[PDB]
Symmetry: C2
Subunit: 191 residues, 2 copies
């Protein structure tokens, strides 16, 4: 049984953890680089400062996990190639100051997630559900937002490309005055 | 011949001027209240401070006319009932501080018009072409903007309902920061 396992600081890089039951596992500071976590259950796992760079998280359940300051650079969480693999479930996950640079989140569920100060630089957010998420001071530079749902998200202080304002659904989304102005310009108004 | 006529301060209220050739006429301070100007040619007429309240201007040519401080309250300039009457042509017309309250401008051509400080309160602007118009400090409260083209218009300092931001085409339209913020909120963003 890997549920509730104490895996803190574990050397798991490139491990085959496919379909593993890791619910409530302590993975703090674990090295999961390029681990196969496909279809794995990570619900409520402690992933704080874990290294997930290049990990395969496709179809994984991260619901309620704490990923604060975890490294997800170029991790695969979303609609890929290979199988008909679904987006990861990150509902209510804690991603604060997580590094998601270049991560594939296409089709992933981030409803209620905390992305405050997170790095989303060049992330694929296509058809990602970011509803009720906190994106405050996050970096969305270069992110792909086609079909992305940001409804009731909090974007204040985030770095955002003009194309986000034209692509993501923003209904109820909280923005600051500069962003509101940027949103206008992105729809073609001149200031 | 009524072209270039000196009609300044004339008592023309309820006159039948239908299809009249008034090109370059001096109508300054004329009383045209409820005049029938249907299909009339007013190109380059001087209408300064003229009273056009309730006038029928349907299918009229006002191109290049000076209407500054003229009273157009509830005038009919646009798609009506009765015939298949077209919107008036107000291309390059000078409407500065004109009173258009309750005027029907539906389908009218205002391209390049100067509406600076004009009163458009409750005006029907449905499918009106306001392209390249100056709307600075104009009052658009209660105005109907369905299908209205405000492309490359200048709206700065105008009073504008939220519904305008969702209805008029605004491409290239100049706005101030408050309006830009209002435009965002009108599309459902929270501030």
């Amino acid at each position: 049984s890997l549920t509730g396992a104490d895996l803190s600081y574990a050397n798991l890089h490139h491990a085959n953890l496919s379909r593993a039951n890791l619910r409530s596992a302590d993975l703090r500071n674990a090295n999961l680089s390029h681990a196969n976590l496909r279809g794995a259950n990570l619900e409520e796992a402690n992933l704080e400062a874990a290294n997930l760079r290049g990990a395969d998280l496709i179809g994984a359940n991260l619901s309620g996990a704490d990923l604060q300051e975890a490294n997800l650079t170029q991790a695969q969480l979303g609609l890929g190639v290979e199988d008909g693999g679904l987006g990861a479930d990150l509902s209510d996950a804690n991603l604060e100051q997580a590094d998601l640079a270049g991560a594939n989140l296409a089709g992933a569920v981030l409803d209620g997630a905390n992305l405050h100060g997170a790095n989303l630089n060049n992330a694929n957010l296509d058809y990602a559900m970011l509803t009720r998420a906190n994106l405050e001071q996050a970096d969305l530079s270069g992110a792909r937002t086609t079909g992305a749902r940001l409804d009731d998200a909090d974007l204040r202080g985030a770095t955002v490309d003009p194309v986000l304002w034209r692509t993501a659904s923003l209904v109820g989304a909280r923005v600051d005055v500069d962003q509101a102005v940027a949103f206008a310009a992105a729809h073609g108004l001149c200031l």
